[PDB]
Each structure stands twice: as C-alpha cells, then as structure tokens.
User: What shape does this take?
Amino acid sequence: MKMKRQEYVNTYGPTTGDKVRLGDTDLWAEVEHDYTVYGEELKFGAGKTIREGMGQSNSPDENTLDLVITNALIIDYTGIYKADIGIKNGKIHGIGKAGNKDMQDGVTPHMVVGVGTEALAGEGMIITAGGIDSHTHFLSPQQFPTALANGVTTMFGGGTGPVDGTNATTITPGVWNLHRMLRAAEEYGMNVGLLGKGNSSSRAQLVEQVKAGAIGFKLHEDWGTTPSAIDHCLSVADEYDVQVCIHTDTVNEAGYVDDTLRAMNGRAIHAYHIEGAGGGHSPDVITMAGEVNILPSSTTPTIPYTINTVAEHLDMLMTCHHLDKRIRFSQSRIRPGSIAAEDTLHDMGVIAMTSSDSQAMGRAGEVIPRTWQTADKNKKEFGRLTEEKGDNDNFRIKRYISKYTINPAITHGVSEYIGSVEEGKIADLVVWNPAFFGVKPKIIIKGGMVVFSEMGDSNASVPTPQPVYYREMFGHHGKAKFDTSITFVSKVAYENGIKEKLGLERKVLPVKNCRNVTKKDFKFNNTTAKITVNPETFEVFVNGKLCTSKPATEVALASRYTFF
Amino acid sequence: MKMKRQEYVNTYGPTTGDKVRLGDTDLWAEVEHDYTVYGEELKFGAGKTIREGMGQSNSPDENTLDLVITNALIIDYTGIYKADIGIKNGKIHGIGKAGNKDMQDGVTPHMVVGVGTEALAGEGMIITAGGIDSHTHFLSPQQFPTALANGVTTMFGGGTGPVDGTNATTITPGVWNLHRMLRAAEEYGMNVGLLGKGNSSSRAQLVEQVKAGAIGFKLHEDWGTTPSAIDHCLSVADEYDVQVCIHTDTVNEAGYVDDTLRAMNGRAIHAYHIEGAGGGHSPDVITMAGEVNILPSSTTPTIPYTINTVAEHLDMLMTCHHLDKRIRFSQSRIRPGSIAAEDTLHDMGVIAMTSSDSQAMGRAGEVIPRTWQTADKNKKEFGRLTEEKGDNDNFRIKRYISKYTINPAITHGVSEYIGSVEEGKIADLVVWNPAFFGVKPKIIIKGGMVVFSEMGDSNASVPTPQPVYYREMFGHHGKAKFDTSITFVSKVAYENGIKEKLGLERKVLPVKNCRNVTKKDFKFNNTTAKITVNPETFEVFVNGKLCTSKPATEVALASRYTFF
Amino acid sequence: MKLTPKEQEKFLLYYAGEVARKRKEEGLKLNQPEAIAYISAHIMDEARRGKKTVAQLMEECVHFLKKDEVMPGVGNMVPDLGVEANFPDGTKLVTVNWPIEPDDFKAGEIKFASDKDIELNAGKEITELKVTNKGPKSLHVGSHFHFFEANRALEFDREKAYGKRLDIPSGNTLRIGAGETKTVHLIPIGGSKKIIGMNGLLNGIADDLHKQKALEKAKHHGFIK
Amino acid sequence: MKLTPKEQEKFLLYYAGEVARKRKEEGLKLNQPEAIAYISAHIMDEARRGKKTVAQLMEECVHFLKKDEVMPGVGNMVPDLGVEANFPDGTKLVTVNWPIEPDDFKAGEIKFASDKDIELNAGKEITELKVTNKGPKSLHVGSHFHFFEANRALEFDREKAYGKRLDIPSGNTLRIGAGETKTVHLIPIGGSKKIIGMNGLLNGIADDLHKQKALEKAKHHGFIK
Ligand SMILES: [Fe+3]
Ligand SMILES: [Fe+3]
Ligand SMILES: [Fe+3]
Ligand SMILES: [Fe+3]
Assistant: This one.
C-alpha cells in the first residue's frame, strides 16, 4: 500500500535522501541509507508492531536484545544513516533491522526483539556516540552533571580538587593522590582516566605514577616544560603504552617551539590548546599543528571566534594565572591572528579534537555546542565543503563529530571500547531531538542503561509536565553505576590487579595503542601542512597562504535555548 | 610505475575483474574487489616486503597478527574477492590490507604485520572455510585423515564404531556411549559433535542423552521413525536447543510422508538424504524439500547423477542393509526420477546441504569434489545461471560452497564459531591451488595452526620432492590439538561442566540456535516449492513442472587427479 | 602426487593382486586373500580403461575364478566381494556376488540337528484378518509393530487387531501393495502388552478396559473410518 | 635391511612409477599422479645405474612425457618436478623444469580482465637519481627499504633520497653491480613515514625537522662522504 511521504516521516522519521537541519545551525545531514523494509518498521505502543508473536518474537534466541532503539538516525564518522540499534549486555549488539524473523522480512539475524527486550522509540531522533572530553581538570565533582547534560560520557585529565595545581594543570601527582582519586571516582556516572605529573627529569617518579593507575602524563609549563622533561616523560610513555599531553613553554625560557618539537623526536603527543591562548610558546605554538606526530586539540573559549573572544581573554587569563593589575598589549596583537586561524584549521581537518579545559580557562558543558557553533560559523563563512557529494554537509558533519567522539578515543587508547556507534563497542550513546541537536540532549545511555535524562515533574501524571530539567537515572545509582561506568588505567596497573588492590567496584579497563597514533590514524582530520607565524604581524600561514576567519557577531545553539 | 598485467598476476595473483577456472570444471570465479593498494602488496622472501621496519612493523601494536595469509582469493558465501587474511589467537582477526602503517598506505588498522607475525603466501591460491560434514557415521577413526585430505574440518553424526547400529545409523546411544565417544574424540584433529538416539516415545531417555553431551538426535527407521517417536524427539530438542536429523519410514509402515510431516508440526528438522536412495518414504520422501521448516541435505553417492549411479545402488543397498539375494525392480523405476531431480534441485537452491553418509551408503572424502562435480554438470547441461551478473559463475559458486560450509553450520547451531571466512570466527580454513580446487587441498588450518597438509620427502632438501602425500602437521599433535580442536556439546551439558566432568582437554563449545532455523535462514539455498512425485512414473515435479537432469558420462575433478 | 590415505591403501591392494597373478601363472591354487586381491586388481584395471560400466563388471566377475583355480572352500568363504574404483564418471562401488566358484568343502559349516521346521510363536491364538491397502503407495508392516496402529491407508476391522502383531518370523515384514488385498495372521503381543509409542493410539496395557478409549482415538485420528 | 622411513616412502613412489609404466604400455594417456611417478621412477633408475650426472638428468627429463602421452592439462598442472635419489656421491636433488610437455588445456586458468598494465604507486611524485656502486661487490636494494640508508658503497645525493623508497613492484629488488651506474626512480614512503631500524640513521618520522640530524648521522657513519 502507498503511504504519503509526510505521513511516513511523521510515523518513522526520515528515510534515504531526506535532509535534517542540525539544531538552528545551517548544517544539513542527509540520510545516506535506510536499513529497513518498508512496511516492516518497528513501532511500540497499543496495537502497534512490538507485540507477542508479532514484532516481538515468541521463539527463544541467543541474540534476544536487552534494548531496541527503533528507527534511529545515526550520525557518526561511520556514516549518517537510518537503522534500528540493538543493545545486549551493555554493548551495541547490532545495527540494522530488528524484529521477528517468524513474522517479518529482512530482519538482521542477531537483532531479535523478544520477551526480554525493552523498547526506546528513536523515530525522528538523532543517535550519536557519547562525547569524550580529553582535557578535564578534576577541580569540582559538579562538573560531571554539567558534562552529562551536554552529551559527554568520558573524561580524561587530572586534578586533586580545588587546589592551585589543579586550578592550573590536568595533573593528579604521585601514587597517593592517584589512588585517592581513583577511589573517589567510584561515586560518579562519568567514565574517567587520570594523568600524572610528566614534568620530571627522573625515571622512577614517572614509572611510580603509571604503576599507580595513570592513563598517561601531563607536561605543563607551571611545573617546568623543559626539553629534558619532554624527553624523559615521552621515554616512560613509550615503555608503558600511555599518552602524553602538553602545555608548552609560553615564555620560551629553555627554547623556542622548534626546540620543543625536536625534544619530542617524532613521538606521539597530545598538544592541548594548540592555538595558544590557554598557554604555549608565544607566538608560534600553533605551528606544531602541521606536524604528523602532533595530535592537536582545541579548548572551548577560543572556538568559535567571536566579537567578544579577545576582550574576554585579556582578563580571563588574569583570574586563572593570578596576574598583577599593573599588567595591561602583547595578547591584543598575537591573539586575533591565531584565534581566527584556529577556526579555519578545524574546517581544514588540521586540528583533530575539541576539549574543555574545565574551570581552568574553559567550559565543562560547552565542548559539544562550541564544536557545532564552529562548524556552522565556517559553513556560513567558507561555504559548503568542496568535499561534499550532494545537497548536504555530511562530510563536514563527520569531520566535526569525530573531534569529540572518535579522535579523542584514538588519542587516549580507548577506541576499541568507546568513541563511535559500532557493533561490539560499549553502549555509551546520546539521543537528540533534531531541533536541539548539539545543544540539549534527551537521553544519555551508558553501558546499555539510561544514566541521565531530561525529566519533568516527579509527582506528575506523565514524564512531560513542567519543570523539565536534567536528572540522574537508575544507571547512575546504587551498584548499577559500577556496571555502567569505566575507570581507565594503564596496562601495567590493570595487569597488576589495581581493581582488586584499590577495591574498585567499577569496570576497570586498560588504555592501549597510544604510542603509534599519528595524524594518519584520525577520522576525517588527517591534514598535515607547513604552518608558520609572522613574528611581527602574528598572522598564521598554511603552506604560505594566509589562514584566517572573521569574528562571529552571533552563534547558533545559544540564545534560543538558554535562559541565562 | 607501470607493471605488465601478466607480471602483476604472476607476482600477486589475480586482481579485480580476473576470472579463475575452478579446477578442471567449467566454473569461473570473478574477483569482485581487491582490498590492496597497488605497489603496497605484501610479499615474503629475501629482499621482499615483510622485513624489519619495512612491511613488518617495528612499532608494537595490540593487533600484531600471529599469521598473515598474503594476497588470498577468498571464495565464500560473503563474496569472491582478493584480500590479505589476518589470524590472531586462533581466530580470523581481520580481512583487508595487512602491513605497516609506519611505511605503507591503506593498511587496515587491526591488521598489523609485526615481529610476532608468521607469513603464509596466498598469492595465486584460493582460500575457503573448512567444510562441515553433517552426516558422519563414527564407524572408523580412519575416516578423519580422509576427510581432512578433502577439506573437511568439522564432523557431526554418531556411532560406536563397526557395530551394526553404526553401520546403519548416525547414533551414539545413551549416557555411557556418549561419554566414551566424547573421551575418544580427544585423539583427533577433527571438530566433532555427537547425535543420540532420537527414536523414543519417552522423555527421560532423550533428556539423559542431551545432558550427556549430545548436540542433537538422529531419528532412524532401523529404530522405528514413527509419528509418536517424531513428536517426542522434537519436543525434547525444542526444550534443549538441539538439532534433530531424520531418516524417515521407507516402507510407509506407520504412515505416508504427509503423516511424518504432520508429526513434525512445522518444527526445525534436518532431513538427511532427501532424494531417498539412502532411505526414506518410498517414493515421495523428496517432496519434503519444498517445506520451509525442512532443512534438507544430499548424501554423496547420488550426486552428481551418472550413467553408473543406478547400477551401483541396486547392489550397494544390499551390502549395507544385508538383504537376501532372492530380492532382484522397484528401485530401478523409482530411483532414476528422484536422482535426476536431486541435481536440478541443488542448482535451484531447493536442497541446501551436501554431506557424506560415510561407510554407511556414502563416501567420507567426497563431499567437496561431488558438490563441485554437480555444480559443473549443471553448468554444462543448463548453462550459466540467469542470476549471474557478468561473465562469471559467482552466484552458482556461492550457492554450491554454502552447501558444505555455512548451511551445515546454521543447521547445527555452530554458525557463530565456524562455517565461513569472516572476522571474529575460528580460523578453520583451507588453502587450494586453483588447478586442484575442490579435488586436492594444499594446507588445512584449524584454530590458526596448520593441522594437515600435502608434504613431500621427510629427508629431502626442500618440502617439494616426491612422494608428495597428505600428512598430519604440528597443530594435530601433542597438546596443540587440544588448542586447535573443538568438541561441540549441548548448552545443558556445557553449562553443567561436561568438559571438567569428563576431563576433556579439547575446546568444549555449546551448540545454540537450532530450533528457529528455517529455509529462510540459509545462504543462497532458501528456495521453497510444491514438490510432487507421480506414484506411477516416479517423476518429480516442482510447482507442476517436471524436475529432471540427464546422467553424466564423465565428471570433472576425477580421472585427471587420481591414480585408483 | 598428493596421495590421499585411501590411494595408499589401493596401492597395497593392487600389489597383492599382482603377486596373486604371479602365483596363478606359476600354477598355484590361490587362497582366500590371494583370490580376493586377484579379482580386485582386475576390477581396478577395467575401471581405469573406462570402457566398461559398473553393471557390465558386476556380471563379468561372477565365477571370475573357477573352483579348480583356488584352494578348496575358498569360494564359500567369499560369497561376495566389493571394490571401489575410479571410473570416468567418478569413484563407483563394484559389487560381485559369487566372485569365486564354490566347491564341496565348507569352512565354518553348520550341520543341522534335524531338517524339521521350527514352530515360531507356538501356542499363540491366530486371528485371520482381511486387509486392503486403499492407499496409492505400497507399504510393509514389521513382526512386532502393533497392527492396530498401522498406516491409515490399510483397511481392516481394527477392533480385531487390538493388542496383536503379525505371526511372521521376528524381524520380517509383510508387504501390502497399493490396491492389494491379503489375509493376515495376527497373534497377541507377548509380555505385559504395554504398548507405548508408534501412533499413540494406545500408550498403555492392551486390556479390555483401555479398548473403547483406543478405538475412539483410532476413529478420531482417522485410522477407523 | 634397516629400512629408514624415507626408504619406505621411496618404495611407494617407485611402485607408483611401475604401475604408471604398465598403464602407458597398455596405451593409456597418463594422469597427473601417474605422470609424476613415471618420471620419478626413471630418475630413481638412472641414479642407481650411477652413470649420469644431476646436470645430465635435469636436461634429459624436460618433456620426458609428451602432450599426447598424458591427459589434457597434465603438463600445465606439473610445471616442475623434484626427486631426491642416491647417486654414487650420495643423495642429490634432481630438479626438472617442464617434465611434461603442456597443451592448450589449463586447469585453474586465470583469464585477465584487460591486458592493460597496472599503475603501481599511482600519484606518488617520482625523483630521478643517479647512483654508482663504488664498492667491489654487487648489491641489491628492496622496494620498501629506506633508500637513504643503503650500503655506504652506493654513491648518490643522499639528501634527495631522504624519506623515499624505490618505485619498483612490491617485493622486487634493484641490482647495482660493482662499478655500475644507474638512474633510479624514488617515490616518498607511504603511511606516516615512521622509519625505525635498517641503519638507524633516522629512527623516527622522515620530516623536515629530523633531516639535519639524519644527514649528520649519515655523514658520521660514513654514508655521506
Ligand atoms: Fe593548559
Ligand atoms: Fe588545562
Ligand atoms: Fe540414513
Ligand atoms: Fe546415514
């Protein structure tokens, strides 16, 4: 029978060839493929499809799903397509067509909807992987609900709480502090991984930290980012398969950017805040982004470049670093050039990741909105990418989503567990209403359970009455949080029973394959170039051409959605 | 640089669009796709690709392969394509492009060739999954080398040895005999699964057998395949997720074919020797093949239909069943009609499997040759299939390969472990030289190790000198055979520690998802029809159209290859 | 060469045949294994030549060796011979009945106590019953099958077959062809008459008490019209 | 006798040769295993006679069986044959290239999609470089070896070979004879260009940043004169 196109879309969501506007941005996602059989689509409700002996099987199966997300529009580096998502044992069991092979055609064999299956209607919703914030200052436990409320499910970084060292650096230093924080982590729903102090010219002190559970090391100028410290840190990182993060020598005390690059010696390193406002070699830190071994991220305050970016920074730097009011400027000439270039470099696929720098010159619940604000800004400025095939922004979308999902996962050695919507991976997923995509998520699923969601009045006759606000769900509570949350550690710690030894009840998993990740390993952001900075004008050059962007007067996913 | 097409093919084997003749048959396999990057192909040898810091990585990786099969031509239901195959932990780790991402372009991320990698040159060879023989009579342990020498790695059936019951039926009856045989299985390289006596009108005796380790039940007329016995057996098999195999009531004693079909009640059942020469309701057992619930197979002696098939049978039946010489005929009028139809039904995808009936009206080392002989015979009589897309027999090849690889695996509930060349499955593979495809294999890999191969003089300066004959390899010996071989059991037995309780050192795995496999579940052989037999002429009709074939005077993969 | 374990076996058989041929040429009477190998090698030779059919060979090899060409009792010791060989159409089984001509000597000879017939099922009460196979296909019924539960295609007074079996040798079957009418001889089942299974018309003791219930089940399932 | 397991194998091979000889005498076209055994037995015979050299036999056995003496496709199926036999000077391997004359039939025949050449390393920028082997011994350099790290005997502008490899088929080698001058074609190394090992001149990414250090190591180790 013939169903009117509007009626089909209302009932099941968009199909092949349909374009979805991402929030209030000018970005259009086109459905590349639909894995359904028209007429066999799953719908939950009274008199609907998912019923005993109909859409729900009465035949037992080894692949009976624990949860079915019906008619989802997946947005991932893997593609922008329409499919049913099947969760089983807190993992993405299958992606395709779910249902009952007894009564339906074209059912994916390992996607059985049965007696033990729970239903979640994804028709008309966007499903993405949970975001990974690889630049977290563990300053306040209140960052976690803010992060979840913005689609972030994993947090890498360091800290001890609101002490001066954490206020500046993403470092949990030494054995005792690492043990204390890993045990504190038990409380939360958020996946965590801690970085130790990398700023050492002695092996023993670095090794102690990896063995204490650190997923890597942070090198920060506040503890001295000298060439000696750069070499020693990477040497231990190479031995123990852990990642290194770097905030370079801003005041060029022990050497210039090239001297730091030389100390690295082509070894894998995660260069935090590549633009340079958050810190790093003045004015040429951005020149590192061109190098193949350099895995570059950007922190939220500089992305997207707006008419208030520079003004906000010429004071935000003074509160964070605690500088004299006698200091006025240098940053007023240096900063516009690199901040402008940063946006363009993101669009070019030169900067591979977006991160927060949470309460340490950056916002916790802003990674996701700011990534899409930049995508939107550049599409408005530089047009639809030449790379696009059709009347859609799919390639740019895939380039931008990779920045906070897959690329941080690859960098930190957790790409086998999380980072993307793929079969076999842990079910850390976010459900979005297209009108609120990138700004306000609906449901946060972690380890196959709902952990956080937008929820109305607790007394109310339905879950919709006002006030609708973000609340912790069952997956975030009791002993279920130990089933849905991961504390990442080094292989050495993992293999030596850190879980048992620290009495951690949470899922403990090792980080692996950190040392041989280059720019070539990323998804949609593999671009290498000869990046140069004029030391007089502070202008950024990509292979001799000028690299710049215009500051935004207004951004998408902001004013329409927030009260304050 | 430009390489002459002939030179490329000599060095790396065929590429996209090339057609390979399977043995001396008239079947042509076309390379559908090539996963390589021209110039980056892996070659092993002095001054070649797979060398320290070149094709072989010096960078440690979590995905360093244990074995690499370079430039293989995969022939599987999944496709006929060119790729490198990567084995790790006795499983197919990856299929694509193997090598070193440090020095090469387009390397599949989880296909790292490193220090711990062994090399096997598959350039110019055909790689297929190991065959599964669903109709094994455990009569003689000498069947195993014969089977391996013909590309068969898994054997399902039953028996006790050379006793009258085994000579006739695929049954290991009762607890004690099942325990004894599962312990005897330890000796071999072959994967095994045992069937118990399904012929019971009492629950207790059937349950005992599943709990003793049986993977299913055989219903054989020699123990009375009555409608009561059929119902009772299927009822227990439904409760315990095990398969049922049936040799029907030849003499129509308790009922006609329709009475047996009625007793089954649409439940999943494996109908051995569907044509009826080896047994079953005379003259209409073939009529069962049209039914959706019926999973049908053919035994080797009737396929392909030759000028000597009928003559051989009208005496081979008298030696097996031990009949009086007073008995002359009925089989002389009944048999041509069904035997001829059987070949056509295979080509039509009506009969889904090919098996052996080993030393019990069929040949152990003939499943694979006879399948291809039938494929070839049909290509020669009825031309290239209408289903084909191009100047190739790819669809027909995929239809025929499925008969002894994937379809038996689906039927017996082991499709998740074995049956096809797919990532994640156990590495049970066969390497073939195209000139000997389907008749004489080169190497037999089981659980990622070579277990059996064609080998020359043991004293000889190289492995090529005469006499070249089949010999057991390291994977078949010592404690390594326990690592490369599987003894399949029921879930109930598995879950109740049958391995520990019987002190089995072999890999013990449960059979699962047997009860809800219908014709729709098969690969390339999902054809259902209204099959009718004229009770006067014995002619077979498919949807009222005569289903027949002409007898072959000569067959491929025979006279050119064998001495006796 | 790629010699399969089955090909290695055939070389031994063929060599044994060649040694037997040599001994026959020397004028020696062949023994049991020599006679078998001599005939086997002939079959293997003809199959390679690929000019004769399996049917031709089965006929050609009857009395291939004559009584005076072999030792006494050899023919009786080998009543049948089987040899698989590759023909142009593939490997086929060549079955020869009486490959060696027999003589008066018999090893393992059974001498009967008496030539008198054996009275099977002695003293059991015989029930004569007219049966007609109204079905389109012929059928057989075994010695111990509960006659009452036979294929619904068979037309007879089922009440009279209740708790009975055929008075025929144990293991034998009676054939009733499509459309054929026969007079069968039925005897009451031995032991306790606890009939469990077959068509499930009884599933208990075949006593008078169970009879009406059984006849009703038979009618309901279509055995009794 | 003290028969070794290898001597037991050779008896089977020799007997197979004898059976094949018999079949050829019968006028039958030999198949793949028969043809191999027929030639093998000849080699084994000549070696025992100890009058012919290995060199003589290797030459004598080319087309030992003619196309019409064997079944079609047999020759193509057996492009080479190897047989170890005891000669007066000990066991030696007799290697025959084309022992059976081929015909128009080919089992496992590959039919090309096109006769057009395959463009290997497509789109990579070619660097022409003059190289001279100033050493006393000839040398070869493989397809994926970092050209810059080649034997110090080779004289060329090493700076121009930094982070490059030969634009030759994968697995092939280029020969530069003692004193020989050649024009080589170099292409940039694939993937990340993370060059670890060989002569340890680089041991890292072949970028501009590592270049001066690499050139200094090459000069210090004698690669650059
Ligand atoms: Fe910083
Ligand atoms: Fe920071
Ligand atoms: Fe059977
Ligand atoms: Fe059988």
